[PDB]
């Protein structure tokens, strides 16, 4: 039945020698990536754009080229408790926190989006704090009025 054919929305950010140290994404008309991730966007067009910084939220962004604006994720500010999806599997959202099993997130996971079954982005991963058998994520989300919010658990380590 299904072939996972999708637009080019998620991009790699590499370090000086070329290791993937994070991710950048096309969403709501912008290319955004965590500010703490110091590398270059592995894309001939995106890497030449002028990026605006937002230290208060660990975000760095630029406007999408007119063309690419269609190849992009849609965000949603509604996240009822339950399970969500990301590159490594299930992400649980309960208690105001997004958690994953311990020993799963780390370098390379910054900038990865957490999604719902309808394919909308619900949050962007920044780092994590292990608490017991789980890891609580430091994520960026936006509220219903479009305000950016940043939740960082105690002892979070940036990925």
The answer to whether position 144 is within a domain reads: yes
The answer to whether position 3 is within a domain reads: no
| Domain assignment of residue 98, given as a range | 74-159
The answer to whether position 1 is within a domain reads: no
The answer to whether position 2 is within a domain reads: no
Which of 94, 154, 84 has the alpha carbon at shortest distance from 124?
Answer: 84
Resolution (A): 2.4
- Which residues have a catalytic role annotated? 36, 58, 110
Read off the CATH number of the domain in which 49 is found.
2.40.10.10
Is residue 137 within 8 Å of 105, Cβ to Cβ? yes
The answer to whether position 117 is within a domain reads: yes
Is residue 153 within 8 Å of 97, Cβ to Cβ? yes
Instruction: Check whether residue 49 and residue 79 sit in a common domain.
Output: no
The answer to whether position 119 is within a domain reads: yes
The answer to whether position 124 is within a domain reads: yes
Residues 114, 158: Cα–Cα separation, whole Å: 16
The answer to whether position 4 is within a domain reads: no
Instruction: Check whether residue 91 and residue 66 sit in a common domain.
Output: no
Handedness of CA 68, 138, 23, 17 (dihedral sign): positive
**Strand partners for 22:** 13
């Amino acid at each position: 039945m299904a072939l996972k054919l999708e637009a080019d929305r998620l991009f790699d950010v590499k370090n000086e020698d070329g290791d993937v140290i994070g991710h950048a994404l096309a969403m709501e008309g912008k290319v955004m990536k965590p500010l703490h991730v110091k590398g270059t966007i592995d894309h001939p067009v995106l890497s030449k754009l002028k990026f605006t910084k937002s230290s208060a939220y660990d975000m760095e962004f630029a406007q999408l080229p007119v063309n690419m604006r269609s190849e992009a994720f849609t965000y949603t500010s509604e996240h009822p408790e339950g399970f969500y999806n990301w590159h490594h599997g299930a992400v649980q959202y309960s208690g105001g926190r997004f958690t994953i099993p311990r020993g799963v997130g780390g370098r390379g996971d910054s900038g990865r989006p957490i999604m719902d079954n309808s394919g909308r982005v619900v949050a962007i991963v920044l780092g994590g704090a292990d608490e017991g058998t789980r890891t609580a994520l430091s994520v960026v989300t936006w509220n219903s009025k479009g305000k950016t919010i940043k939740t960082t658990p105690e002892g979070t380590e940036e990925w």
